[PDB]
Symmetry: none
Subunit: 301 residues, 4 copies
């Protein structure tokens, strides 16, 4: 872990053991730290971190913090259980019971309920406990962490918008950034939410999400996800088309879909194309020959 | 610090001290942790976070890690001096002599050299020691850390490419992801180097960086910056225009440039609009009316 | 009236021919001289022959002689343009025309010119509505074949009459089966374009396609000379028709693109006309025209 | 030349009596004669009946059959049969070639055969031998030109190197008056064809010349401009701006205009503009859009 990494970085930058502990601990003590035979304090690592000049978060990662613990494992097992709907059964029975052990397990658990509805496996349990679970986790909350946003994102995918919208309102506006991981999670929710909104032609909720996202940009140090910014901006375009049948807005939307293709985002392109097709279909309006030609051969697969 | 946040998160989620300290430490000690009268260890805070179910890094950020030490305070000061150049001279006379204390300081140092070149200020010692400093910092180096990528990105901003490329080559390709923070840095060097390359019409170097970025996209657990991906693709489109004058590649570029305006990234758009006007000139080509419409209004 | 002889002499000498070359086998030297002196009538037959000898097109010679005017009817038709700029002349003039509005199909066309002006400079011509309907019946109930002038008359009517009243008169004049010259082609085409503009305007999709078809039919006629500008504008009205029929985003795009070509090639007045059209067409459909075309229209109205 | 019956046809159609036509122009027995086609009618007389019937003088003539009438007409018509039946070339060329200077019409027809001949790569050695003396003989003492002169020039441009015609063209422009729709078309064709050639050979100085001559036409009273030509000549104008300073906007306008030609159905012009855009591009070591190279390739 840490200790090794410190000795490594220390020597790389050509610092003697002395430059690191000089005014932080004993040589007898510091040797124990590099030997990985004495836990280092968060505050201590921090000082060494500065002395060396290498970022604290980097040192941690360079020492193994990354899917490196009980819950970490349980989470990886879903990308696999996805591509093997039979490796399900034995796993859904060990998790289901402990789905409220911590917020992280509720996420994972919802991850299975997703894989379920997908391949169409059975989950009669989900229908008779989702409401009980939610109340137990979001009835008396005053603060939300990354994991809560991750959870709401999973919920949106396995639950009718009506059942999840109540949970969301209390989680925005965001006023601070608590890391890049946190920044990403709080943004995913807005994207998912907005997409669904635009899809139910629920313009009032759409505007709300579009606005929450515009707000995030003003937050000091927040790391906006470019792909998201580009997709939400596409949704903002459709939003204007639904509001005043603006033609430029429709063009801007088609245009952004093409950009996603031009930069190699096959997945997002397919999604945004099928998305645009349906929307127009409802508006009783035909999309360009371009987009439709893509839809077909995305059905021929 | 940490303890406060730990307790705060614990109660928010309705847990008892038992649920946390059990199997890790005595209830007697866990009280000192939540009181911050005892320093917690990286090993412990990790178990506690796993228990709480909240991101380890998020807890640390909430606990204040985000600026604190003198190195960070000095970093913030840069942009201050940037807005008010009058702060330069005095602060520079404090940093300059410490530029080799640490990689963080050398970066900050290169920061002033940037502010200076912008306000035509004179920094005579730079030219007198830049080559020596770089030779002293990167000759016995074998592996590189995030900070080095930040440094290289800076060098490209205050030094002629030729004096940097050699420091840049042994730093790629990237093999592992070491956190979103580190991910973003190794990406920036490519964008800045690729940009300078396309500008100098150095096609060989340009395609090298283009491939290095593409390689990152294959690394497990790497956060690709969407904005960069969209800008590098534009440099890639320009790359093709310069290679074999393709009218469509020129269109595509113009197209991405316009997307940067629609989604509201005004500064990248200003940037790219000048970049195209200058590239088109060297190629004896007239950019679209639209592009120069923006360039001209921007310059004012 | 026409100076055909002088024109002949002008061409004959420019091409370095001698009189014998022209008259031999057609007339005596004595008479050929009277012909060039413009002191002896020349037949269509003879002129056609001198035309073959000279090698210059018969129509051009007549044109060079002045077939573009020299007669009472032409002067009246010319006088209209004046009255438009200076309307005080309307009255005393409209008192001469009106009573002769049926003398020939030409005078009737002129007559409608006046009725058009009057409408513009808000003048009141009560006699018009008092007789127009009786007039048109008198002019078209016993008809079987239609000439170029009848198509001009129809375009005039579309300008000073509700569509429904002019519509019945048009129908029996189509489809066209044969061309009778560039002059005739242009007229049978203008009716279609003007009628189609009005169709699409009243969102009358079935009438609209009628004309669109009539037009496209003209393209299959031997030696028909399709007016390129019309072909473009009518294809714009075709793109609109398709949008109004099933809201095609591409169809709307085409319409906008064609509107742009008119700007690129410099056809100012038509570009103004179309930008104004699309702006109204669109509103009715609860759509907003592109920012582009709205900037133009708003700027044109700014005069 | 059955003008008398056509007057009868029209006179009755418009429900007019014989007295409505001859009252003030001629006697009754003479007019009777006229409609019977038993007495030639003078241009003046015909212009008068025309005003009484209210129907176009030129329309009445076309309705009477001026659409053919004489030997020169037959010879012109025969050029289509031969263009699609080369085996018919030799018999008629032996007849035409010798009459090529009989009149300007015949010289035009003659040029028609030389075009056909070049197309089917047929031998016509008498041409290369007498073409120059011919031009000299027909255009040395010329001061003013007529329609057939512009027709002849279009012909010359099609079977002769540009450099041998340019000099005969210059004296025929600018045009000052219009002399009917037939004439107006002819004069525009020369410009359109000549500008096409100039743009190809990349002769910019001359290209501008034809572009300006066309522009002047628009300022002429009663001139009937050809929409298709206007659109196509403007296309060449855009290509002109492109060759002059590689203006990207100009290039895109060219492509857009090529598209319009397809959108409205002019399959032949489109096929033509598609080819030259490809050849013109290739020369400039420039590649056209995927769009137009597609159409071109599939046009073989």
């Amino acid at each position: 872990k840490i200790g090794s990494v410190l000795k490594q970085i220390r020597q790389e930058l050509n610092y003697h053991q002395i430059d690191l502990y000089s005014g932080i601990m004993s040589k007898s003590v510091y040797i124990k730290v590099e030997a990985d035979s004495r836990p280092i304090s968060v505050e201590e690592l921090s000082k060494f971190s500065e002395r060396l000049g290498v970022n604290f978060f980097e040192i941690l990662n360079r020492a193994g913090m990354n899917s490196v613990n009980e819950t970490g494992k349980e989470k990886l097992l879903i990308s696999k259980i996805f591509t093997n709907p039979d490796l399900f059964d034995k796993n859904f029975q060990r998790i289901e019971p402990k789905r409220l052990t911590s917020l992280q397990y509720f996420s994972i658990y919802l991850g299975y309920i997703s894989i379920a509805h997908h391949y169409n496996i059975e989950v009669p349990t989900f229908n008779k406990t989702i409401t009980s679970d939610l109340k137990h986790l979001y009835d008396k909350r005053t603060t939300f962490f990354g994991i809560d946003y991750e959870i709401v994102s999973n919920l949106l995918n396995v639950l009718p918008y009506e059942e999840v919208s109540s949970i969301i309102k209390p989680m925005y506006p965001i006023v601070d950034s608590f890391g890049k991981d946190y920044d990403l999670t709080i943004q995913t929710v807005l994207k998912n939410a907005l997409t669904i909104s635009i899809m139910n032609r629920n313009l009032k909720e759409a505007q709300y999400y579009i606005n929450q996202f515009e707000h995030l940009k003003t937050i000091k140090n927040i790391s906006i996800n470019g792909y998201y910014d580009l997709e939400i901006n596409y949704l903002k375009q459709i939003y204007q088309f639904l509001t005043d049948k603006n033609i430029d807005s429709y063009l801007n939307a088609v245009n952004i879909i093409n950009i996603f293709k031009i930069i190699g985002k096959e997945d997002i392109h397919r999604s945004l194309v099928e998305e645009l097709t349906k929307i127009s279909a409802k508006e009783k309006f035909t999309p360009p020959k371009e987009v439709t030609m893509y839809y077909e051969n995305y059905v021929a697969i």
